Ligand binder design. Sequence first.
Ligand SMILES: Cc1c(Oc2ccccc2OCCn2ccc(=O)[nH]c2=O)cc(Cl)c2ccc(C#N)cc12
Lengths: 401, 547
Amino acid sequence: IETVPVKLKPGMDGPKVKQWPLTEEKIKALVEICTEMEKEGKISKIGPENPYNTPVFAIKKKDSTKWRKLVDFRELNKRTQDFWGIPHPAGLKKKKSVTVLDVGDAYFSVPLDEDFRKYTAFTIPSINNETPGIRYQYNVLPQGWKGSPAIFQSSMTKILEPFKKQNPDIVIYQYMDDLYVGSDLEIGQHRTKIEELRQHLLRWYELHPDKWTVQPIVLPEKDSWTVNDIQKLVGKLNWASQIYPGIKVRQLSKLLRGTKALTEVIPLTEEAELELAENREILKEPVHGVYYDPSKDLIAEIQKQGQGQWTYQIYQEPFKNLKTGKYARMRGAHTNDVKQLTEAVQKITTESIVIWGKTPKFKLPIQKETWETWWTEYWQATWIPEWEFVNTPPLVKLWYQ
Amino acid sequence: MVPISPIETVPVKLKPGMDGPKVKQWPLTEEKIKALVEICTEMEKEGKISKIGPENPYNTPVFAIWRKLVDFRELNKRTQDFWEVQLGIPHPAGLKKKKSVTVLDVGDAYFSVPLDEDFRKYTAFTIPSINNETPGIRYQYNVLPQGWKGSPAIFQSSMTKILEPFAAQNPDIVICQYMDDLYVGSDLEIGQHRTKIEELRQHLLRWGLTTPDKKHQKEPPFLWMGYELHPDKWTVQPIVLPEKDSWTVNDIQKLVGKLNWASQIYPGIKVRQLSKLLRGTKALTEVIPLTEEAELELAENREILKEPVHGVYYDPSKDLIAEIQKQGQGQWTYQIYQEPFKNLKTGKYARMRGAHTNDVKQLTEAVQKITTESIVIWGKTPKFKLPIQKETWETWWTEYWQATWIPEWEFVNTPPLVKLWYQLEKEPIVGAETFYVDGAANRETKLGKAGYVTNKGRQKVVPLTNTTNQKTELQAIYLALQDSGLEVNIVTDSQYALGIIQAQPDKSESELVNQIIEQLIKKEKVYLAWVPAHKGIGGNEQVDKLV
Ligand SMILES: Cc1c(Oc2ccccc2OCCn2ccc(=O)[nH]c2=O)cc(Cl)c2ccc(C#N)cc12
């Protein structure tokens, strides 16, 4: 009920980001939503003296036909001053099961600092520029803004205090408009406890971290090797030698002596089997000197493996992976690569939030124009990560498959 | 007197750290002075401006051309930033056909809207007296000045605020808002329409906004922003293509622009051969000759621009269709329509600046462009008619390393059809010869060698002058393709060549790459394997090309 003064970073003006085109149904959806929000004082119409703008669009969350409004506050977020710090729960990723809740509505109670309101300006566009866009600014805490959870931290603490005092074994974390709740209960007991917590939040997405670990580099186990098999093996070992110190390939390369047909079977020498064995033992060990640095950015690379399979690696320094994985979940995106990629980015970002409490910068195996054209159609999260585009096919594709 | 409703002012500030403009007034002739005196006297009588005391330290230069002209450029540099929504203009193909349609141009647009009184002291200007023997006459603005930065935005927002309730109370009509103009449209009978227009201008008059009292000064066809709007159709204003035996860069830019403008309704317009001459720009004065390609292209452009073509208006009840054709040399043309042979509009797409490319990617990009444009104009994605087989697209997107997608579409059999020209094998070919290739060049002498050794004992090494490592690496693969059968396995250590070929181009800027493509097309099966260099991999003979 009391507004806390919020400013921007020294030497930075407010965000001025072009609104991108929207389909008619999304425009109508946003019109209804923003009209209703205007009737509730959550937003107010603004004049032309406000030069700032932040993009806005409409989505549909899981198991709901109701249109939701999402604001791309990325620019405002990076322009918003740094709010200070709660150390990330390193036990959240260690918990058996974690459930994600949407506590966004709770933000609409707390008023936003008046002098800062002009920075949250957004525009509902019109089709074919027939009329000027409908311009609004937020009066309460906007969802998607990084200042909203920071300001509501005290309130959220006071609200969750009884529940935390009740179950000291349940880890509670918060990121943006989402509340991550981890524990070691049973799925039924988990769901009932979640209903308990949500009805506790009322009067005021099953995710299992344990089923996700880090992935080792594996080598084929064959009784007979072709020239091609040994060539690929040598390529992969040579690649892995950038990561693991003791990898050697001279005894395996010794087998490729001569110009043999690729499909010709070559029996392994004892030295070759020994070398391969030592390489296996080496690969079975964790990577040397791999640490997380909270001051550095997380980088996420994704490769399309085909047939709905996708691989990914999260690192900070090259060949120093903090996490690796393989998203192969099929969910109504059998014929659409972009939908699959989008869902993959969302899942990877979610895992990244659970582990480090921040979002990685993605390198997407897709043309900028394609992604830019279609990604909002399949997006269901309230946060939005940063991304860039790789236009040259990486050779390391099949080395993660 | 009936009290005209008050228009609430917009709070305006200057840019942070700056102050109001203070510019020395220019010396004017006695005639100009008298003229400005008369004009400003009349304006002061009308209430647009007001005399101020000597206290005001700010000043803005004024000129006479009689019509007065206050140069607010410095104030424009010192005035805050405003939200301009005028970016983009209504496209005729987006307009929904209405039985009756009226155009209203507001008179004294900016002079009907009050200015923030706390800002009026920054719009001060001085009329020089005769012989400058008396203190110049001091004035300040009370309304929005013509030429000011904030005037269009404020006038626009004011007009929107005023118009909103009338539009809300009249859903059976549609009102488009554009600068000093309003465009109303309805499917009502002409009498009801004229009635509602009279009601509208009455409603505007309640706030003191004047509209054409007579029969409205503009009737169809409407000539607006290079367009011709007719009751049942739209087109562009007639084309003017200058003809001179000596062309400059600026003339090339103008010609290109005009052809581009013509292409939105005239199908088949090409501008590549004329745009290639814009390399080495920023030099507006030059004499650039024309190739036979460019001359034939421009002649073909005149051929298309020979007879008038019209586009229709949009009907939300019918489907939206976009059909694409390949034109060659990275050129694509498209038509957007609902009924056959009746285009809503047309357009073109040119491939981006790349070293390698293929038709499928270009078609994809074109599809994105048309999609975005269509979302802007009609607020929806059109159904596509594409010159590519379903199975071709299937194979492409299923085997492509990048994620890709095309919205709902169907195959239209209008050549040339986009196709996949070659497909690399996923596994080594049994019974096919194995070519281990390699190339290497000397960095200093630019002398190199490229070649292969095979499992059957076939060998070749060719010496090359003026070449690089990458070139020899490509050349080796090219040799292997040249001398091999219809099925062949190829082993290379070149991550460069492998990158290029895995990008899957059908055309390239490098002649060598294009020749490699031509070889690949003639092949039945090609398996391309990669190995690390200098790892003592037998077969991979780096020492054979380093001699
Ligand atoms: C005249 C008119 C419009 O008209 C319309 C206004 C509101 C709604 C629907 C309209 O048009 C649907 C299409 N159409 C068009 C012209 C016509 O004669 N008949 C017709 O059916 C819409 C626009 Cl952007 C205009 C922009 C500039 C000018 C000028 N000068 C006039 C315009």
